[model samples]
Target: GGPIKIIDPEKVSKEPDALLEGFEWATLDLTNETELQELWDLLTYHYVEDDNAMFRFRYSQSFLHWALMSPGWKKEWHVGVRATKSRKLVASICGVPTEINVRNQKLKVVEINFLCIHKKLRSKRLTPVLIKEITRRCYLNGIYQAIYTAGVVLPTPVSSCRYYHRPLDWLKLYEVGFSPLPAGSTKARQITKNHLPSTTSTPGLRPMEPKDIDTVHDLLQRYLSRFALNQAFTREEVDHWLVHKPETVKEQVVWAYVVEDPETHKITDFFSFYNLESTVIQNPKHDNVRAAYLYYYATETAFTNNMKALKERLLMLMNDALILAKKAHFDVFNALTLHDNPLFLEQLKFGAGDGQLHFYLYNYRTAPVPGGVNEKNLPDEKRMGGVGIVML
Candidate 1:
């Protein structure tokens, strides 16, 4: 019960063992190319290769060097964790915290980009310790809370919002090795469980084509327009983030899907997701398994007219994607939700009681705000919806 010690990551390497004795923590200086390479190697070895023995680290030095040198790397926030005696980086978390107006009031929160631990060391209960350390770091820096998206039930109380999801490639997810809880358990589970005629039924879904760009952009705009303090993506930003151009797109793991009219082929709804490749999870026992991520999902008002229909379609798409994930050998799928969408999320099979997902909140300052945001006093345009993250 002593005060937690925090040190600037730059000075960590030179600090006495007593200062970092039982626990280990450090922040990555992204500006340092050599340090970035080291961090990338540690992550790729444990996450991509799932190897623990020091000798088998598979990522080539050139590859790590190139990745560390890539543009846009500046946007990321990286932190490292390890045990003192081990001296090896065992866990790391990354995210970007952007300033936004919540009900017109300016506030800052860290949005977790990726969090993972070395495969062998995870069982030692290092996750919560890292969380506490990260929380302490954020608090000292004046960051009120940490916002992240995950597939597990939040470990802390959360306010959630639901969004429609569709898998661009069901077979891909299945081939990647993603699977869901058995239908029997899904049925017995208290979270919104609905029956679908078949898991593979594609009903009105189709691959996203270049011709559908305008509609897709419009659909996302409509979806994002509902939020008071949401980030708006310009057409260029949308294209950069969602479009599958050959060069950047190939390096990215993204899927864009559309629910269209079977006859006319007009797009009715659309959703897109891509794994955050920078964030990787390592599990030694699962050789073929990797984790894919959840991203943007949007539906035309016509398709989302009723909450039930929206839930059904979204879950169906996700279920179908699970089949694809299994084939791809991916073991997990992750996502985040905001407060506005909790009602819709409650109706989907994914919710608070599922237990597979977890949520947490890091209150930046001592303020009386519902769901951690001062909603009542803030201007209507600046109110923020509580957020959630999930993994499947």
Candidate 2:
């Protein structure tokens, strides 16, 4: 969320983030499709290639819908580094608006993402400069803190969660080396155990429409508040995120669903996930890994004050979501152990993944929050409720 604090912010010549010789800073106009693609091109080639040499993060066009066009987004925060002579877009860092609750205090902050630099320019070490520039821009706008996540540990981490994955396409995953065949397990048995339903079992479940905004907003507003460190969202943010805009099936980046009551026509639950195909570097069999990340979700069952009812409702809703992701050709479904995820992760067959996603806060100091894992990285009930924030 574009962090703003500003005197002469427009005239950043006073004090600014510097680049090495021949590189310059440029504010990106993501509204222009040409400029958007240029940014995407850089990230697709340079973004994340985590844990192994095999995969690279591939963010699609409509993904930009949520990343750059959220309710409080700003072009000024879309900082870019370019070749001063040819105007070639190379390095970049971006921020958008977010207000987070820190203990008893409410803090306005920025959600930073999409930091990238061209491959040939890796040694230039433009990352720190981009971070400084973005922080300065945030300072000028009145915002004082920031949030980001990565595989590596930095000076600080407010909270962290290990990734858990449920494979959707077993055979493809094994063939592409994305999934290793567990010792003594047959391919047939692996497929059989991971088998999912063809259709959603929940009654009255359907895609979230714009008309459902007010109810989802109201429900999610109350639902999210239960967490100690959750985003304070407006109805506008709710609409932009949870109500699906229905991009093409091929390029669709988000899938949001709601459980509507047949008699009352009221929305009782909401859940969403996003597509992010990782570019496969080593495999010749597949070009990318179609993966889905569990995004924000809320259920009215949580309000019943009955743990049993809430757990049952979540299992049903999330199972249906797994089915939907499979229909869309996702190979694996991944989720951080945040929200009420520990309630269903092991029960739903999501295996603990290799890496931990550490959430870091800048220009702010706070105690680390639990993220469904405790000493020695074992999953525990007490660790589940503390992590409420999800980073993109």
Candidate 3:
């Protein structure tokens, strides 16, 4: 009736019996105004203050509150699990159900939203317990998979992966609280020893302009068409995501670059990125901020004949970004590899980390569409969560 009851971990004696007796997990019924507000506050605080990103959490709090309060919230795809003993809020995990197109057909899936645990009670092994409980709930709902992204690698098998990285904005990352190199380790030396001429030695390099959208979009389509799990964005999605300037730009935090055909003025290749700053490092001074990200890149079919040329152009673009990032002051560039583009990522100096990030899928009644690319294949569909969710 009120906020889910909060329990004191101390009273539980850290025993399974105590936990079972004191803790109860139940779905959030949006119809209850109190539950909706509690969920909203918990999610907003965790996403903005703790995660230091508010992409998904940016939706209107009142809208979210209203959505949870609606009848369709549960029927369509809403779920929230809370831990309560008496009548105070302690922890929660909220999820929304949606359908993702896999293999040219829509399939059921659940996307995890806010997952937060009170700082004081976190060490009681609450995260995994909550996950298990949520998993069980989804199973009961006939949901077969769950999807989520995290800076830290998840323990389960990953379906798809992407890195939230920025170029050489190490200092900027530090400013925002992300660390690149481990403590006691020497600073990472630049991969390229010497700087090259500002302009390309070869003719025909230029900044991306509005006129090049068609060619750029076509080239990107070709590159993306090669992947199995890719979502082909319409012109609007592309423009909003890549070409158009947001009202509030982060100022070099997110950027794009391209090369063009001198005579026709057609865009031949392009790449873009976003800055990711994290505050969760061991030492705040040494490991403050880091730029980690990805976006899109494509070379025209005509340029396919000149693979070396294409590579050089793309490298130059990336190199130039690194230089600009240095000017802006940043440290490390972190990028992730997808199944289809592993080779491309390798050429860019991205390697598989010791850990893996998992994207779980929860299908509400039907089996997931097979044959789509996953972490083990090209263009894993699981990595399609919005950029804000990661970079914010």
Q: Which candidate tops lDDT?
A: 2
Error of 2 at 368 (Å): 1.6
lDDT values, one for every candidate: 0.48, 0.83, 0.48
Rank order by TM-score, top first? 2, 3, 1
The digit string of per-residue lDDT tens for model 1 on 212-277 reads 778887877566555434444455545545566665323445567777878887777666655433
Alpha carbon lDDT of residue 118, candidate 2?
86
Question: Could you tell me how far off, in angstroms, the CA of residue 156 lies in candidate 1 after the best superposition?
Answer: 5.7
Worst 10 residues of 2 by lDDT: 1-10
- Candidate 2 deviant stretches above 4 angstroms: 1-15, 247-250
Model 2 residue 248 lDDT score: 34
Model 3 TM-score is 0.54
Better of 1 and 2 by TM-score: 2
Tens digits of lDDT, candidate 2, 1-392: 22233345555544685579998889999989899988988888888877677888888867875678788888989989889999999888899988887664678889999888888888766778888888888878876688788788888687888899999998888888878778999999999989999999988999988888888889887887777678877889887766665453345677889989988988899899988888888777788788999999999888887878888999999999999999988899998888888888888888888879888777777777887887877566667656777777
Model 2 scores a TM of 0.93
Best by TM-score: 2
